[PDB]
Paper text:
Schlafen proteins (SLFNs) were first discovered in regulating mice thymocyte development, and then found to span across mammals with great diversity. SLFNs were reported to be interferon (IFN)-inducible, and their functions have been implicated in various biological processes including cell differentiation, tumour suppression, immune response regulation and the restriction of viruses. All SLFNs share a specific N-terminal AAA_4 domain (Pfam04326, termed N′-domain in this paper) which has a very limited sequence homology to other known proteins and was reportedly involved in tRNA manipulation for certain members. Investigation of the structure and subsequent functional analysis reveals that SLFN13 is a novel tRNA/rRNA-targeting RNase with potent anti-HIV activity.
To gain a functional insight into the Schlafen family, we determined the crystal structure of SLFN13′s N′-domain. 15 vector-encoded residues fused N-terminally to rSLFN1314–353 are clearly discernable in the model. Mutation on any of the Zn2+-coordinating residue rendered rSLFN131–353 insoluble, suggesting that the zinc finger is crucial for the folding of rSLFN13. rSLFN131–353 constructs were eluted as monomers in the right-angle light scattering (RALS) analysis, whereas the crystallised His6-tagged rSLFN1314–353 was a dimer. The dimerisation of His6-tagged rSLFN1314–353 is likely mediated by the artificial N-terminus. Surface electrostatic potential analysis of rSLFN13-N revealed two positively charged patches inside the valley, whose width is exactly suitable for accommodating base-paired RNA. Substitution of conserved charged residues (Lys38, Arg39, Lys42, Arg217, Lys224, Lys276) to alanine resulted in reduced nucleolytic activity, suggesting that rSLFN13-N may embrace base-paired RNA within its valley. Apart from the positively charged patches, a negatively charged area formed by conserved Glu205, Glu210 and Asp248 of the C-lobe is also observed at the rim of the valley. Mutating any of the three residues diminished the nucleolytic activity of rSLFN13-N and hSLFN13-N. Even at elevated enzyme concentration, E205A and E210A mutants were absolutely inactive, which differed from other single-point mutants (D34A, E47A, E84A, E96A, E146A, D193A, E221A, E229A, E249A, D259A, E323A, D350A) regarding exposed and relatively conserved aspartates or glutamates. This result demonstrates, that Glu205 and Glu210 are pivotal residues for the endonucleolytic activity of SLFN13-N. In addition, this plausible active site appears only in the C-lobe but not in the N-lobe, suggesting that SLFN13 cleaves only on one site of base-paired RNA.
Author numbering:
A (entry chain A): -1 to 112, 120 to 159, 179 to 351
B (entry chain C): -1 to 10, 12 to 112, 119 to 160, 180 to 247, 250 to 298, 307 to 350
The structure:
Amino acid sequence: SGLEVLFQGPHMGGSPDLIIHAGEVTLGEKDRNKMDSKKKRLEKARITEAACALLNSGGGVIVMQMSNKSEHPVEMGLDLETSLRELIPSSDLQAFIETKQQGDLFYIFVKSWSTKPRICSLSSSLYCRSLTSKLPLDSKETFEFLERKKTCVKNDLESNPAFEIFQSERLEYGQRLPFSESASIEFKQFSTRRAHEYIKSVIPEYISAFANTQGGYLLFGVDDESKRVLGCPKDNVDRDSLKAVVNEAISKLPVFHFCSSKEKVSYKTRVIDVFKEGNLYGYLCVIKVERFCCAVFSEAPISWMADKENGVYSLNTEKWVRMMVDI
Amino acid sequence: SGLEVLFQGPHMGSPDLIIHAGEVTLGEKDRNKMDSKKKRLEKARITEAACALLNSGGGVIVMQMSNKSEHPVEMGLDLETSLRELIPSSDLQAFIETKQQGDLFYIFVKSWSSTKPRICSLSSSLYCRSLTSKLPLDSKETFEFLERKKTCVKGDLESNPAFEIFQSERLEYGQRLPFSESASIEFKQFSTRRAHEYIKSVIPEYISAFANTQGGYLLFGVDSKRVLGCPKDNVDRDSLKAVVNEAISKLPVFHFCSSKEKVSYKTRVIDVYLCVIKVERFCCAVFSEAPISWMADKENGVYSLNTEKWVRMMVD
Ligand SMILES: [Zn+2]
Ligand SMILES: [Zn+2]
C-alpha cells in the first residue's frame, strides 16, 4: 500500500508525456480556507506556473501529493480555480482542465491551447493609462493592443497644462496646484521610504502606461487628497542621483518594436527645488514621457512554457510577442 | 494507583459481551473543541460498537478517557445523536446507560427486540426516489420497503419524453425538451472533475433509487436545464460503457424469489459526450452498496454483515 501507479484506470488511449510534479499541495476549499496564508500563495503560484506552461506547450498533466491526504476533497478549491480560469482567455476552464484524485495523488490535466490570443499568461506585464482600472491588460485587452500597434505601422505633451510646473525653476512648500489627477497627470507622494527606492517601484508601471497612451507627466512629491506640493527632504538626495535613478529605472523597461526604429522610450526628467521659506526644504521630481512607436513593458511578461529537455522556463520579452500574435 | 477493576461497585452481573474501543474523549464541553478528524473517527468507532451490540444481545463498550483529570458524565451531543439513529424507536434512555469509573467510561447497551425491524443499522445502503429527500431510507422506511416487497411475492413501463434524447444520436447545446427534471429523470452536470470518477461516484446511489422506483433515466452532463457534456480528450466511448458496466455490476441486489438475474439497464453515449442510462424497474431490491451494519461475538470478533443475512433480519 501507499503506492499509486501513475494513471490507473480502464482508459487505454495514449497517455500524456509532458507531466509536471508540484510536490506537496493541500486541496479542498475547507482545508485551504484556514491554512497558512504564506503556504497558500506558494502552492497557488506553483500550480499556475505549471498549468500555464502546459497550455502553451501542447497539453500535459500536473501531478502532486496531498498534504491533507485522508479527506479526498475531489475539488480543486476556489483560489486555485479562479487563478487557472483567469489564465484561459475564454474562461472556459471546464473545457481545458480535468481533475482526477487517486488515493495519495491528485492530477490536474491541462489541454493544449493551440480573433483570440495565442498564448496564456499569468500577467501581460504591459499597462495602459486607463482611468477605469490600473490593472495590467488581461488576455483580451492585451491581444487587441499588440495587433493594433502592429497594423498601424504595417504638441499635446507641450500644450497640456502640466508643462508650466514641469517648467518651474522653483516651487514653494504647501502651494496648492491647479491640475488634478487626469489621464495625463499622475500624483505620487513620498513616504518614510527612501526617495530612490519609492521612485524605482513606481516608475515601471506608470511610465510604461504613459508611453502606450499619448504620453503624460509623472509628478513625485504631491499629495493626492490635499493636492499640495510637499516633495521629499533635500538632505539625503541630490539632483544627479534622482535623475540617475530614473534613467536606470527607465532603461530596464523592455520594449518590442513592430517597426524598423529601435528607439527606446524617450522622456525628460526634471528635479524642481521646493523651498520651505527661504530655505531649501527638498525636491519635487517630474517626468515627461513621450508616446511610443510600439510597446513598452513594465517588466518581462509573466508567462511560462515547459519542455522535457528545457524544463519549465520563462519567455523572453520579444518572442513572447511573436508567440502572442501573427508578426 | 491508576488501576481499575472493570465492574467496580457492589451493584453491577457483569455483562458477557465486552468490546474495547481505544482512547476516546468524552463530554460535550471537551468533544466540541477536539481535533475534527479524531472526533468523527471516535464517533464511527463508538457507533459501530453500539450497532454490533444492539444486534448481538446484551453487551458493553469500554473505553479509556483521553481527558483523564476532569470527569464529564456526558458523551456529547454528537455521540447521543448517532446512537439515537441506531435505535429505530429513538428512545436512547431505554437502551443506553453510561457509568464513569476513574479513567474508564462504560456504555451499557441493551439487547434489541408489534411490527418493527429486528436489526439496527447505521444506514441502509438502499435508496428510493423521494421528492425533496435524496437520503437513504432510514431503519423504518427500509423495513416498510422490504416488507412491501416481501409480501408482494407471496400473493410505469412507458416511453418517457426522455426516450427522444436517449435515442437522439446527435448532441447540441440548449436542446431543452418538454421533459424537465422528473421523478424518472435526474440531471447531473460534469465539472472540472474527470468523467470516469464522477460517474463511478454517482451511479450506485441513483441507479439504486431508479430501479426501486418504476425505473428512470440518468443524464450525465446536463446543468439551468442546459447540456454541457464532458470533454472529448480524456475519455473514449468504450470507456464510458465499460466504467458503467463495471460500476453497476458490483451493486448488490437481493431477490425475494427464484430470479438470479441482475438489474436490467441500457447505457448509451451520445457524441460531441453525454452519458444516458436507461434502467428498468427491478423485481425486488437493488442496493447502492452493502448495508452498513455490524454484529459481534467472541469467536467471530467485530464483523460486518453481508447483504443477504441483513435482509433476512427483516424477514419473519
Ligand atoms: Zn516602434
Ligand atoms: Zn426478484
